[PDB]
Design a binder for this molecule. Structure first.
Ligand SMILES: O=P(O)(O)O[C@H]1[C@H](OP(=O)(O)O)[C@@H](OP(=O)(O)O)[C@H](OP(=O)(O)O)[C@@H](OP(=O)(O)O)[C@H]1OP(=O)(O)O
Length: 151
């Protein structure tokens, strides 16, 4: 099934990148998958892109992606990770230009869910949810949770 495939591709890419950053793997979570899929259907129905109430109260972390076409899991995770090119490891903290990358690799995050839905014009709306929530801007937390890559 297309949904299982998308789940596998997004998780495998997240975990390859987390191993590069020396943090533990994520596991998929059934409940986060179901909630992320529900939210993706709400976004695709209106063609709107904005964060959920859950995200805005810190109940979960959330990454959003859009394309005019049905996106693969690898393509979504690679696009989010590519934000590392804008991240300054000697100036740790949030920026909008790096926020999907820093949520993907956040050390303390343990579980994720993902969903995807098409709109009426064939565009697609993707939602990933993360628990515990990352991207916490409290002093020191990015330095503790967003580690440099090792080869
Ligand atoms: O729904 P069942 O007939 O009980 O089969 C389930 C189910 O397979 P389906 O995906 O077709 O529903 C699980 O998949 P989901 O719940 O993710 O949809 C799958 O888990 P996996 O996603 O890892 O394939 C699980 O397998 P398992 O219990 O070994 O983890 C498998 O159960 P059985 O294959 O043992 O029947």
């Amino acid at each position: 099934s297309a949904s299982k495939q998308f789940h596998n591709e997004v998780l495998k890419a997240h975990n390859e990148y987390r191993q590069k950053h020396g943090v533990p793997p994520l596991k998929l979570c059934k409940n986060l998958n179901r909630e992320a899929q529900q939210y993706s259907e709400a976004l695709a129905s209106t063609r709107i892109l904005k964060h959920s109430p859950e995200s805005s109260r810190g109940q979960c972390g959330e990454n959003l992606a859009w394309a005019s076409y049905d996106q693969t899991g690898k393509e979504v995770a690679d696009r989010w990770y590519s934000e590392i090119k804008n991240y300054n490891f000697q100036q740790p903290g949030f920026t909008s230009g790096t926020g999907h990358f820093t949520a993907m690799v956040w050390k303390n995050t343990k579980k994720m869910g993902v969903g995807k839905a098409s709109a009426s014009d064939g565009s697609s709306f993707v939602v990933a949810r993360y628990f515990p929530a990352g991207n916490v801007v409290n002093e020191g937390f990015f330095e503790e949770n967003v580690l440099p890559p090792k080869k």
